[PDB]
Each structure stands twice: as C-alpha cells, then as structure tokens.
C-alpha cells in the first residue's frame, strides 16, 4: 500500500556514443552528439543518483507492486516542452501526458506539455486488473517515453522502463526475491537525423553504445536471473534476439531466441550454467552487419556448487554408436533436378548446362553430406529413399544417444558447424568466439581446407522443453565462420531436440506417423564463395563479364524451398487419419519474414488449431498436420512478387479405393495389403512387440519422474453438397459490387473544424466491397445497423457455430470474376475458390471462378478443429476474401471476417450469435497502385505516382477509414471482445495500443501484454475491460504510423447512462417540439411524461383520418448528447385506452440527414416494440446507444389513436457527468453542512441535510432560518472531485411556494477556504439563474469544472425565501 514516489528530470547531456576514460583524446572529443535524457534525482533535486554504467541513456527504472501508487515529481530542465506517457490502464486525463483531440478543459492540458523550467506531479494507481496476478511471469515490463513528439522526442534519447510487478514479490530496494539479478536491455536505433540536433547517424546501438562497446555485464554461475528486454525505434524495425549457448523460458515456451518488434517489451528467466564468456546475438540479417550485441561473462562466487543426477536414472543410458560423421564437399548442384517434368527455361540453358556455353556443367555448391562410416570411405545414400530427395542430414538429439559430431572438412575453404541452443563443453569450442584459449585448454572453431576435427556434445534430460511447447523442437545448424557468405554457399541443416522417444537404437518416433522436412532458403550466389567457380573460372561468355546490372545480379537470386526450385514432382501423398509432422525454418540474406498459408487443413498450436504460421528469419518451428480431408491442396506463402506466387508445394490427401495401395503409386509400408501379410509396424522381438529398448529381465525401476524433483522439502441457384455433412445449416446471401469510398471520414463532419486543409490526394477511390442481401433473388438488401458502423470496408460478419454447416450464395456483380476462400475451415475442392490444379473435370472447378452477373453457392463445414479452443474464450476470429488474385483483390476492398463460436452462443434475434459485445478491426495499409481500379496517370502527376506528393497513394487505415472510424463505443467496466486481424499489409508488423487500457488473452487464462503485436496472418481474440470514461485514443505506437493516420478516438462513456434528458423535469423547454401530422387538439408542448392536466399528449391540428401514415414528433437538445433508451406512456382523459404497440425511432445531428434505423435495428430483425396499456410507464433500451442532436420517433400501430408520451434516457458530453450519489444514497448525510437546521416554534424542522432530488416525504429541502443574502450551503465531497454541473430546485409546504432565483458559487482548494467563481473571460463574479417555477428543474454548467472537494452555494437573489434541493454531477478523479 506504499507510494512509490519518484523524482525525474530531463537535461541536455553531451553524449558521444561510446565511453572512454583517458585524457588526451577525451578533451578534444572528435565525435559527439547533443542529447536529452531522463536522469533520476534524490528528493528535491539536491543530489543526483549514481546512474550505473550499463545504462547509458536508458533513464531511471520505475517500478511498483499491484496495489501501490506512483507520484512522479517531474521537472523539465531542458529547453523544450516535454512530458511522460506510460503504458497500461492507470492514467486519467491529467496524468497521461498525451495531447490529442479529446475535448478537455485547460486544466487537464498542463500534463500534456511542461514548459522548460517548470514542475508538475504525475500520479497513477496500479489496479487489480493491470497486473499479472497469475501464471504470467513473476512480473511484466512496459516502456515509458515522451508523448509530446513521438519522433523528435525519442531519437533525442528520451525513454525509460516501467516495470510493474505482482503483489507479494518486490522488495524495498526494487529487486525481486527469488531472482538474483534485475537486468534491463534496450535494443534501439537512434536516428539522429530525425532528432533535436539533425546530424546523420548510422546508429544501431544498445543502451546508447555502438558496435558492441557496452561494458561487460557479468554474474555468478548456477543462479536464477531475470531479464527485461525492451526495444524501441521510430521506424518499424525487428529484433530477433538470440542467447548463445543458453535457454530461456518466455510464455511457458522453452525458447532460445526472443523476438521483439519496435516499441514493445517482455520479461524472461533463465538459469546460468558453468562459467565462460557468451554473446547476445541479434539474428536479424540487418542488425548483424550493423553490429550490436553485449557480453555475458560468468564469474565464480564461492557460495555453493550443486551436485545432481548425472546418469539417465541408470536405465535409459542409450550409450552406443549413434554419433554423426558429417563432412563438407562442393558437389554439382541442380536447382532444377535432372530431367524433371516441369522444366524451366531460365536455370537450365543459362546457368547449368553447356548449351550456349554459359558456365559448363558443374556448380561448386557446398553441403553437409553424411557418411555413415567412421573412416569416411562411403556416403550413406547416393540415390534417394523414394520420398526424400534433399531431406537434410537429420540430427535427432535426445537423452544420451552418444551424440558425437565427427567432422572432416573436404572443401577448398575454412568452414565449421554451429548449432542453436546447444551449450558447448570446454574441450572443443563449437563456436567462433574471439578468446580461443592456448594449446592447453584449446578451443578450435574453424577447419582448414583438408583437415579433420571432432566436436563433442551429447544432450541429456536436463533441458527438456515445457509441455506447452511442441513435441519435437527444431533448430538449425550452419557454418559460423561467415554466416551470410557460408549459408549462401549452401551450408544448413536441421537439429531436432525431441523427447524420450527412443524405442530402439535406430530412433523411431511416436505420435507422428509421417514426417517431412521443409525449409525456405534463399541462396544469393552474389554472396557465395564459389561465384568465381560460376562466372570467373567455369564459363565461355566472360568476354564482357555480366555484373553490376539489374538483369544479371538478380537473375542468380535463387529463392527455393529445400533447394529444389521447380516442384516436388511427387506431390506429398498421404493416407487418412494420419498425423504428419512438419519442420519449418527459413534463412537467406533478407530482412523480411514469411507466412505460410496451409490450404485445406490446420495444425495444433498450443491446443489452438491455427492455419497460418509466421516464421521468423533464421529460427525454426515445428507443427503437426492431421489427415481429415480428400483431394489435392497447397502450402503457399504470399508476400510479394518473388515469393507469393512461387513458394508452393502441391500435396494430395487421398486414398483410392481401399486405402489407395492396392493398385496405385503410393505403396507405403503397412502395406495396407491383406491383413495376414508382413511388413514394417510388425516387428515382434524375443519378448513381444515394440515396448521399449530391451534391458534387464524386469528392472522394477519403471517409474517416470517429474523432471526436476519437487525439491525444497436467372441464376437463383442454391447449395448442393450438404448431403453427408448432416448439418444444422445456416444461410447467407453475400454479393460484390463497386462503390465510391474515401478513407478520410474526419472531413466528413467528424473532426473537420478547419476550413483550409488542402486535400493532398484524390477525392475518393472506386473500390469493390462486400454487401449482404436477404434472399436468393437479390435487390432486397439489408442495411448496416448501428452494430456495423465501425466495419468500414469489411463485409458482413459471417457468424456460425461449432459443428454447424454454412451455405453461402455468393453472387458476383462486378466487372471481373471473384470468389471466396475461408480459413481453418473444412470443405471440398468444389467449395474452395482457390485457383490452381484440381482432381476432376471442370465440375470441381465450378467454384474456382465466379464470372460476372452470376452466382455460386459454397458449402462450408465448421467442424471441431474449426471452433474456439482454449476454454477461456468464446469466439474464434478468421477471414475470408476474394481469392482469385489474392493480392490485388484484398487491396481492392473485398475482405471480411468469419467468426466461429461455441455451442450455445445465439439469441432469439434471428439466431445470429450474440450476447457479448465485439469490435472487429483489420489493421491494414491500403495501396491504390495494387488495386484493380488504379487509374495510373492520376491528375496530380502522370510521370511518377503523383511525383508532387510522392507515395501519397498508400493509406494507413484502421479497419477502413482514417482518423475517424466512428462506431467504437463502449461502457465503463464491461468486457468487450476484440478480433484483431492482419493479412493485407504483410511485411508491416503492427502493435496495437489502446490508451488507458490493458488487453487480455485466454487459454492459459492469464496474459496482460499491455499492448499486443499483430503478426501479419495471425487471428487474435482478446478481451478489454474498459477503464474510464472520456475521449480516449486507439493507435499503433510505431511513431511513424501513429502520425501517418492510424489513430482513432474511440469513446468510453458512463456505466449509469440512465438519467432523464429533461422532458419530465423541464430542462428541454417547449420551444423545440415539432410535429408533422397531429392528433386533434393536444399541443405537442404537452408531450411531457407524467404530465397531468386535461391535454397531455402530442398534436397540433386535427387529423380526421389517421391509421396508415407515420407521423412524427421531433425533440431538440441544442447540443450533441447521448441517448440510451426511451420511456413511452399512454394517454387518456377518462375513457380512452389509446396505447401504442409498435413504433420506430429516427435521429440526426443536423436535422437534415436522418438515420431511421434504431426501430428495425441490429438486435431486432425488422421491427421495434412499444407500450401495452394506459398509463403504466414502459421503457425500452438501445443496446448500441445512439448519439445525436435531434431525435424523432414515429408510431405505426396503436390503439385507435396513435398517441404517446415520451421521456428519454441519456447521459452527458465529456462523458463523466454521473450522479455523485445524492438521491442514489452513495453519499451519507455527513457530507452536507450549512447554517441553520431552521426550526419553528409551532411546527417542523427545515433540514439542509435532505437536499435530495425527487425524494418525497416531509420537508425535504433547506428553508434557511431567516431570509438574508448571507446564507450558504457547503458540500464536503470527502476527496477532490471534478464538479461538472448542478441542478437546482424549489420547495414549499402545501401552500404558497417560494424558490431561489439567482446564485453565485464560492469554492475551495483541498483545504478550508472560500473563493468566488469569477467567469473565465471576465473581471468579476459570474451570476447564475436559479429556479423559475416550483417543481421544474434548471441545469447550470461550469465553463471550467471546479476541481475541489469543498464547494459552497451562495443564494444571492431569490423569491421570498431560501429553499432548494441540490444535486451535483461530478467525476471520480485520482
């Protein structure tokens, strides 16, 4: 419950990018840079903290436990305004530091920009729902920075960690209990060109140190450590950190490489091993050449040395000849193999053969070849094993299988090998570290061209992966001499860290029948060590050497998959009910990443069945696909020209007829023959069939341990295929049709207060967008309700259920063909829509293309592996798009979500899944040069793409529109679901950040993450739990996209928006009640709910016939308000039943453009509902609340006279004018003080302690003792609050009434004082207008709110007495 007070300051530190403690060159410092950073101070800024060395510009580290507060006492000592902005849920509008359009008063604008040489005070509060609190890591990490200028105030060196932790861990010194260290690492890129002192800089630093000049950080050996890896850069960078020789554990995944994208952070743990130096490598092929790393030296502290189990429990020893005698060679390589079916013209007759005498016959291509003999006298296989081809030398490592790597360099250059996540033994280095010790304890890394060598490491059962990880981990191994040059030469393999899966010393696996190796390498011959043996030596046209030319240079860029370019001419055939296991990885001198769409099936991923994998550069991943379909399919990547339409691997999934191995070309080894016949899978040894590795007779010691001991103790067609699926079908009628569409919705009267913003692009653009119609015969559409206001460009949400069956009658209506393609779903090739080779005549090709003005009816089947796993969640998002040309279609607008929810989620609202809010958002940047309707020579510049506005034709949209995206409205403290998707703009990884909010995952039931990184292809379902009302801001915190256009001001409102908007009270005067048609004589100024008299309903003139037309009454508000319901009522004089039954509602913010859609609205199908009898107050609710100035209702069907009385239910503007609790009872009577509890001597007592609005009983107001202009009513709010508005009233006693008429307001500070309320733009006090009638209310507003907890009300001029019932509308500030 403590308060983490913190003193910070910002000063201009002259900072070179390296440290040096000398003199001669340390006065004349040749290189330097101006910088502004964060430096912590002792209280009152007298002294200054030590500022440990390893943190160069990384500012002070803030921290807290769940429950405490933070009072950062900022003080800007630099010469430009600055601020501080953390990440999470805490900040109210005066402690967030960001200055955007949120409609706040000049009081809460001070935190946004602190002038140079001025103080402030930042206060936060770590709630119970912003911390981990469960199986999350012991405690998380967030980055705090400057929000005044997200680009000029970061590269100037303004950043710092914010390390919030879990209740019960953090000590007083700011260090965890069990952990022995608290390290923080800032991988960053400080572009000094976009900085305060704009000088060019090629800086790829870490903490402010370049090329690895950071001083060595060191710890002891065999202890537990805690990491905190930040990362931040203006541009969209990527940091694939790698810990050499060690293993980490983030997110319960025993990973050996942590990936961070810009403006993100994470925490992780590891236990250090024996001593010896190490390196923190950055795997990204760009952060390598640049040069950035650290050093991990390990000391030897004389405290304790552990002694644990060495042998594998004395039974699973497995000590035999299962070592590996690998080597290197330079054999001939055919990228397209010898005489394939699908020949290629480029690589054959221009790059291998002597046809037109290009090179010769030979490629000098190195590869790790595997000899099975020790003496290196024979390869293991010269031909192939019927299904491998180039399945690499498989290195399967498990507990003590005598894994010895014998190595015989037989090449013409120094080479080596280097695995991943494999600690070395000091007998042989197995790494190219600098300090290779002397001849005594030697550690050799390279091998000269002709030598031999011997490595040594056999893993034991001491680093088994977590159960949440995959079955068989996969890791590469390559030549560590020069990575980019050696891998290009062709040195790479797979190192498989499986589990205790050995049944025999041959090493077969279980739980995965068939396995296939697939890596995505890209051999850049221009960076190979045999280009000279390609053009220089072996050649016949070197006459004028082809080089430095776009043709020749890019022609030898051979991006392949397992080397072989053309095709696996044997498509990967399979059986049914099998569980194939795949191993994925990728290398190549290229920064970008890949995503591998898996057409047709899906694979388990942490018990979720995802269908797209984003594999990162130079680190692998393993999946498991199941055979539950029949037909041909694909495995494709889709990023851009060289890889999208190229990387494909066709593979069957079939059997015919029994199991397909009686007369066919897939004879496996069961062999599905007569059951009485012999083959593999039936190898009965002496004892019995496969049980284990045979050992002692019984060896009673057959207990499996826990790992580490628990120690410390007309084409109107329909669907046709739904015959055997036997489904609970659900029908939809989509279409596709052109439309005009311009992203900029703020100039569409959203936030266009300006009048001179010159449009820098085209006015609008012609897209093609999905729609939703009502039946098989079209032209009867379904308009987008209030729910679908934020969809923007996405089609209709196609919802479903587990084990359902979907029928979709797509019907193209555009100029070129289109189609559909689901994801993670089940269908047939005649229900796929993808364009490639099939297994039938153009009968299965009926869906592959939907010609214009026609229609096809797909049949999709959502099975068990297509539903939302991870019981912590409810619905599972997905996507569908026009997959005829998947790159130019999605960039045209044809994209939509496809949700799948569990069994039970659907209400009697057409049975479409409902019962929990959900916003769907597709973060994507739209390119107009990749669409179909891209008129090339636009009217700005025809030569280049608007050379006058270069690259102005790419729009960073947030789900359609830009800067506006209206429709995002949530309550306070309500669980809303979010389906964030990203498949359009691939190479741009996005990180989603809501202001003042903390997201959440499920499955493992707990994950906060602060902000989430959207991987291009992932489908993420999260939960929000909105925090506080006001105008917040949704964006992506990559500073060069937040300013580019990805920022939407979503809205949190109050959680009690149920207050009358003035109809019954009297706020809404009768000067603004209109009517088109009328009912007799009953003036509409008398349409007030619960109004008595003789005429109490709506009319102006006489009707004489009213049953068919739809008259209307129009209420005005004079300001934009919220409306969350309506309170209907019936009228009569003595004998008119006269009630309305059905009635719809319109609304408008301009009185001209009306949106009549809340009657037959979203939750409704095509109707609304109303009253049931005479005066019995009946009310309805607008589930998505509406917000408009004018509102107009129209009754259709009533009882013999369509009358009504209406009363509205809304809230306010800033969005926190909630009842402070007077009438609610949330305030007790001990927060009200005044002068006299005025009593008579022949009657009652006049209580200034019952000033409740609309509370009834005895004298329930404050008639002061004696009349004078010097009484008052003082309210002690018990904590400083923002007092927004006031409502006065009048009182009486059964007789002549009297009431206040005009009052002034004296208020206080935190303490006891009283000061007048001088009008902002005046020189004297402000005067208010009190009541005018007895019971009617009057609302008075404050131009700036009164931020206090003392407030006095001065009755200045009144009517014959002081008397009022009072209610303040305030806000719970902190």
Coordinates of N, CA and C in Angstrom, one line a residue, residues 866-989:
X866 N -12.3 -26.5 -36.0 CA -12.6 -25.2 -36.5 C -13.3 -24.3 -35.5
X867 N -13.4 -24.7 -34.3 CA -14.0 -24.0 -33.3 C -13.1 -23.3 -32.3
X868 N -13.6 -22.5 -31.4 CA -12.7 -21.8 -30.5 C -12.3 -22.7 -29.4
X869 N -11.0 -23.1 -29.5 CA -10.4 -23.9 -28.4 C -10.1 -23.0 -27.2
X870 N -9.3 -23.5 -26.3 CA -8.9 -22.6 -25.2 C -10.0 -22.1 -24.3
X871 N -10.6 -23.0 -23.5 CA -11.9 -22.7 -22.9 C -12.1 -21.3 -22.3
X872 N -11.0 -20.6 -22.1 CA -11.1 -19.2 -21.6 C -11.8 -18.2 -22.5
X873 N -11.9 -18.6 -23.8 CA -12.5 -17.7 -24.8 C -13.8 -18.3 -25.3
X874 N -14.5 -17.5 -26.1 CA -15.9 -17.8 -26.6 C -15.9 -17.9 -28.1
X875 N -15.4 -16.9 -28.8 CA -15.4 -16.9 -30.3 C -14.0 -16.9 -30.9
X876 N -13.9 -17.4 -32.1 CA -12.6 -17.5 -32.8 C -12.7 -16.8 -34.1
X877 N -11.9 -15.8 -34.3 CA -12.0 -15.0 -35.5 C -11.3 -15.7 -36.6
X878 N -11.5 -15.2 -37.8 CA -11.0 -15.7 -39.1 C -11.2 -14.6 -40.2
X879 N -10.9 -15.0 -41.4 CA -11.1 -14.0 -42.5 C -11.5 -14.8 -43.8
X880 N -12.2 -14.1 -44.7 CA -12.5 -14.6 -46.0 C -12.3 -13.5 -47.0
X881 N -11.9 -13.8 -48.2 CA -11.6 -12.7 -49.2 C -11.8 -13.3 -50.6
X882 N -11.8 -12.4 -51.5 CA -11.9 -12.8 -52.9 C -10.6 -13.4 -53.4
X883 N -10.5 -14.7 -53.4 CA -9.2 -15.4 -53.7 C -9.3 -15.9 -55.2
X884 N -9.2 -14.9 -56.1 CA -9.0 -15.2 -57.5 C -7.6 -14.7 -57.9
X885 N -7.3 -13.5 -57.3 CA -5.9 -13.0 -57.3 C -5.7 -12.4 -55.9
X886 N -5.3 -13.2 -54.9 CA -5.4 -12.8 -53.5 C -4.7 -11.5 -53.2
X887 N -3.8 -11.0 -54.0 CA -3.1 -9.8 -53.7 C -3.7 -8.5 -54.2
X888 N -4.2 -8.5 -55.4 CA -4.9 -7.4 -56.0 C -6.4 -7.3 -55.6
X889 N -6.9 -8.4 -55.0 CA -8.3 -8.4 -54.6 C -8.5 -7.7 -53.2
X890 N -7.7 -8.2 -52.2 CA -7.8 -7.7 -50.9 C -7.4 -6.2 -50.8
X891 N -6.5 -5.8 -51.7 CA -6.2 -4.4 -51.8 C -7.3 -3.6 -52.5
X892 N -8.3 -4.3 -53.0 CA -9.4 -3.6 -53.6 C -10.6 -3.4 -52.7
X893 N -10.7 -4.1 -51.6 CA -11.7 -3.9 -50.6 C -12.5 -5.2 -50.2
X894 N -12.3 -6.3 -51.0 CA -13.1 -7.5 -50.8 C -12.5 -8.3 -49.7
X895 N -12.9 -8.0 -48.5 CA -12.4 -8.7 -47.3 C -13.4 -8.7 -46.2
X896 N -13.5 -9.7 -45.4 CA -14.5 -9.8 -44.3 C -14.1 -10.8 -43.3
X897 N -14.7 -10.7 -42.1 CA -14.5 -11.6 -41.0 C -15.4 -12.8 -41.0
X898 N -15.0 -13.9 -40.5 CA -15.7 -15.2 -40.4 C -15.5 -15.7 -39.0
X899 N -16.5 -15.5 -38.1 CA -16.4 -15.9 -36.8 C -17.0 -17.3 -36.5
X900 N -16.4 -18.0 -35.5 CA -16.9 -19.3 -35.1 C -17.0 -19.3 -33.6
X901 N -18.2 -19.5 -33.0 CA -18.3 -19.5 -31.6 C -18.8 -20.9 -31.2
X902 N -18.8 -21.1 -29.9 CA -19.0 -22.5 -29.3 C -20.5 -22.8 -29.4
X903 N -20.9 -23.9 -28.8 CA -22.3 -24.4 -28.8 C -23.1 -23.6 -27.8
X904 N -24.0 -22.8 -28.2 CA -24.9 -22.1 -27.2 C -25.0 -20.6 -27.4
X905 N -24.0 -20.0 -28.1 CA -23.9 -18.6 -28.3 C -24.8 -18.1 -29.4
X906 N -26.1 -17.9 -29.2 CA -27.0 -17.3 -30.1 C -28.3 -17.0 -29.4
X907 N -28.9 -15.9 -29.7 CA -30.1 -15.4 -29.0 C -31.3 -15.4 -30.1
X908 N -32.5 -15.3 -29.5 CA -33.7 -15.2 -30.4 C -33.7 -13.9 -31.1
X909 N -32.7 -13.6 -31.9 CA -32.5 -12.4 -32.7 C -32.1 -12.8 -34.1
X910 N -32.9 -13.7 -34.7 CA -32.6 -14.4 -35.9 C -31.6 -15.5 -35.7
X911 N -31.3 -15.8 -34.4 CA -30.3 -16.9 -34.0 C -28.9 -16.6 -34.5
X912 N -28.6 -15.3 -34.8 CA -27.2 -15.0 -35.1 C -26.5 -14.8 -33.8
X913 N -25.3 -15.4 -33.7 CA -24.6 -15.3 -32.4 C -24.4 -13.9 -31.8
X914 N -24.8 -13.8 -30.5 CA -24.8 -12.5 -29.9 C -24.5 -12.7 -28.4
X915 N -24.9 -11.8 -27.5 CA -24.9 -11.9 -26.1 C -23.5 -11.4 -25.5
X916 N -22.6 -10.8 -26.3 CA -21.4 -10.2 -25.8 C -20.9 -9.2 -26.9
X917 N -20.6 -8.0 -26.5 CA -20.1 -7.0 -27.4 C -18.8 -7.5 -28.1
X918 N -18.5 -7.0 -29.3 CA -17.3 -7.4 -30.0 C -17.1 -6.4 -31.2
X919 N -15.9 -5.8 -31.2 CA -15.5 -5.0 -32.3 C -14.5 -5.8 -33.1
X920 N -14.6 -5.7 -34.4 CA -13.7 -6.4 -35.3 C -12.9 -5.3 -36.1
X921 N -11.6 -5.5 -36.0 CA -10.7 -4.4 -36.6 C -9.6 -5.1 -37.4
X922 N -9.5 -4.6 -38.6 CA -8.5 -5.1 -39.6 C -7.5 -4.0 -39.8
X923 N -6.4 -4.1 -39.1 CA -5.3 -3.1 -39.3 C -4.6 -3.4 -40.6
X924 N -4.6 -2.4 -41.5 CA -4.0 -2.6 -42.8 C -3.8 -1.3 -43.5
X925 N -2.7 -1.2 -44.2 CA -2.4 0.0 -45.0 C -2.8 -0.3 -46.5
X926 N -3.7 0.5 -47.0 CA -4.3 0.2 -48.3 C -3.4 0.9 -49.4
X927 N -3.0 0.1 -50.4 CA -2.2 0.6 -51.6 C -3.2 0.7 -52.8
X928 N -3.2 1.9 -53.4 CA -4.1 2.1 -54.6 C -3.4 1.7 -55.9
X929 N -2.1 1.4 -55.8 CA -1.3 1.0 -57.0 C -1.4 -0.5 -57.2
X930 N -1.9 -1.2 -56.2 CA -2.1 -2.6 -56.3 C -3.5 -3.1 -56.6
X931 N -4.5 -2.1 -56.5 CA -5.9 -2.4 -56.7 C -6.1 -2.6 -58.2
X932 N -7.4 -2.9 -58.5 CA -7.8 -3.0 -60.0 C -8.2 -1.7 -60.5
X933 N -8.8 -0.8 -59.7 CA -9.2 0.5 -60.2 C -8.2 1.6 -59.8
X934 N -7.0 1.4 -60.3 CA -5.9 2.3 -60.2 C -5.7 3.0 -61.5
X935 N -6.4 4.1 -61.8 CA -6.1 4.9 -63.0 C -4.7 5.4 -62.8
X936 N -3.8 4.9 -63.7 CA -2.3 5.1 -63.4 C -2.0 6.5 -63.4
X937 N -2.2 7.2 -64.6 CA -1.8 8.6 -64.7 C -2.9 9.4 -64.0
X938 N -2.8 9.5 -62.6 CA -3.7 10.3 -61.9 C -3.5 11.8 -62.2
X939 N -4.5 12.6 -61.9 CA -4.5 14.0 -62.3 C -3.5 14.9 -61.5
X940 N -2.7 14.3 -60.7 CA -1.6 15.1 -60.0 C -0.3 15.1 -60.8
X941 N 0.2 13.9 -61.1 CA 1.4 13.8 -61.9 C 1.3 12.5 -62.6
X942 N 1.6 12.5 -63.9 CA 1.5 11.3 -64.7 C 2.8 10.5 -64.8
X943 N 3.9 11.2 -64.7 CA 5.2 10.6 -64.8 C 5.5 9.6 -63.7
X944 N 5.6 10.1 -62.5 CA 5.7 9.2 -61.3 C 4.4 9.2 -60.6
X945 N 4.2 8.3 -59.6 CA 3.0 8.2 -58.9 C 2.8 9.5 -58.1
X946 N 2.1 10.5 -58.7 CA 2.0 11.8 -58.1 C 3.3 12.3 -57.5
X947 N 4.3 12.5 -58.4 CA 5.6 13.0 -58.1 C 5.5 14.2 -57.2
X948 N 4.5 15.0 -57.3 CA 4.3 16.2 -56.4 C 3.9 15.8 -55.0
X949 N 3.3 14.6 -54.8 CA 3.0 14.1 -53.5 C 3.5 12.6 -53.5
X950 N 4.7 12.4 -53.3 CA 5.3 11.1 -53.5 C 4.8 10.1 -52.5
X951 N 4.4 8.9 -53.0 CA 3.9 7.8 -52.2 C 2.7 8.3 -51.3
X952 N 1.9 9.3 -51.8 CA 0.7 9.7 -51.2 C -0.4 8.8 -51.5
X953 N -0.2 7.7 -52.3 CA -1.3 6.8 -52.7 C -1.2 5.5 -51.9
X954 N -0.8 5.6 -50.6 CA -0.9 4.5 -49.7 C -1.4 5.0 -48.3
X955 N -2.5 4.4 -47.9 CA -3.3 4.9 -46.7 C -3.2 3.9 -45.6
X956 N -2.7 4.4 -44.4 CA -2.6 3.6 -43.2 C -3.9 3.6 -42.5
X957 N -4.8 2.7 -43.0 CA -6.2 2.7 -42.4 C -6.2 1.8 -41.2
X958 N -7.2 2.1 -40.3 CA -7.6 1.3 -39.2 C -8.9 0.7 -39.5
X959 N -9.0 -0.4 -40.1 CA -10.3 -1.1 -40.5 C -11.1 -0.1 -41.4
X960 N -10.6 0.2 -42.5 CA -11.3 1.1 -43.4 C -10.8 2.5 -43.4
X961 N -11.5 3.3 -42.6 CA -11.3 4.8 -42.6 C -10.0 5.2 -41.9
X962 N -9.8 6.5 -41.8 CA -8.6 7.0 -41.2 C -9.0 8.2 -40.3
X963 N -8.4 8.2 -39.1 CA -8.5 9.3 -38.1 C -9.9 9.3 -37.4
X964 N -10.9 8.6 -38.0 CA -12.3 8.8 -37.5 C -12.9 7.5 -37.0
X965 N -13.0 6.5 -37.9 CA -13.7 5.2 -37.6 C -14.8 5.3 -36.6
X966 N -15.9 6.0 -36.9 CA -17.0 6.1 -35.9 C -17.7 4.8 -35.7
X967 N -18.2 4.6 -34.5 CA -18.9 3.4 -34.1 C -18.3 2.6 -32.9
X968 N -17.0 2.9 -32.6 CA -16.4 2.3 -31.4 C -16.9 3.0 -30.2
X969 N -17.9 2.4 -29.5 CA -18.4 2.9 -28.3 C -18.6 1.8 -27.3
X970 N -18.0 2.0 -26.1 CA -18.1 1.0 -25.0 C -18.6 1.7 -23.7
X971 N -19.1 1.0 -22.8 CA -19.4 1.5 -21.5 C -18.2 1.5 -20.6
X972 N -18.4 1.6 -19.3 CA -17.2 1.5 -18.4 C -17.3 0.2 -17.6
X973 N -16.2 -0.5 -17.5 CA -16.0 -1.7 -16.8 C -16.9 -2.8 -17.4
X974 N -16.9 -3.0 -18.7 CA -17.6 -4.0 -19.4 C -16.6 -4.8 -20.3
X975 N -16.7 -6.1 -20.2 CA -15.9 -7.0 -21.0 C -16.3 -6.9 -22.5
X976 N -15.4 -6.4 -23.3 CA -15.7 -6.4 -24.7 C -14.6 -7.2 -25.4
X977 N -15.1 -7.9 -26.5 CA -14.2 -8.8 -27.2 C -13.6 -8.1 -28.4
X978 N -12.4 -8.4 -28.9 CA -11.7 -7.8 -30.0 C -11.1 -8.8 -30.9
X979 N -11.5 -8.8 -32.1 CA -10.9 -9.7 -33.2 C -10.0 -8.8 -34.1
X980 N -8.8 -8.7 -33.7 CA -7.8 -8.0 -34.4 C -7.1 -8.9 -35.5
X981 N -7.2 -8.5 -36.7 CA -6.6 -9.3 -37.8 C -5.7 -8.5 -38.7
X982 N -4.8 -9.2 -39.3 CA -3.8 -8.5 -40.3 C -3.4 -9.5 -41.3
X983 N -3.9 -9.4 -42.5 CA -3.4 -10.2 -43.6 C -3.1 -9.4 -44.9
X984 N -3.6 -8.2 -45.0 CA -3.4 -7.4 -46.2 C -2.0 -6.8 -46.4
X985 N -1.6 -6.0 -45.4 CA -0.2 -5.5 -45.4 C 0.7 -6.4 -44.7
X986 N 1.4 -7.2 -45.4 CA 2.1 -8.3 -44.7 C 3.4 -7.8 -44.0
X987 N 4.4 -7.3 -44.8 CA 5.7 -7.0 -44.3 C 5.7 -5.9 -43.2
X988 N 4.6 -5.4 -42.8 CA 4.5 -4.3 -41.8 C 3.8 -4.9 -40.6
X989 N 4.6 -5.3 -39.6 CA 4.1 -5.9 -38.3 C 3.6 -4.7 -37.5

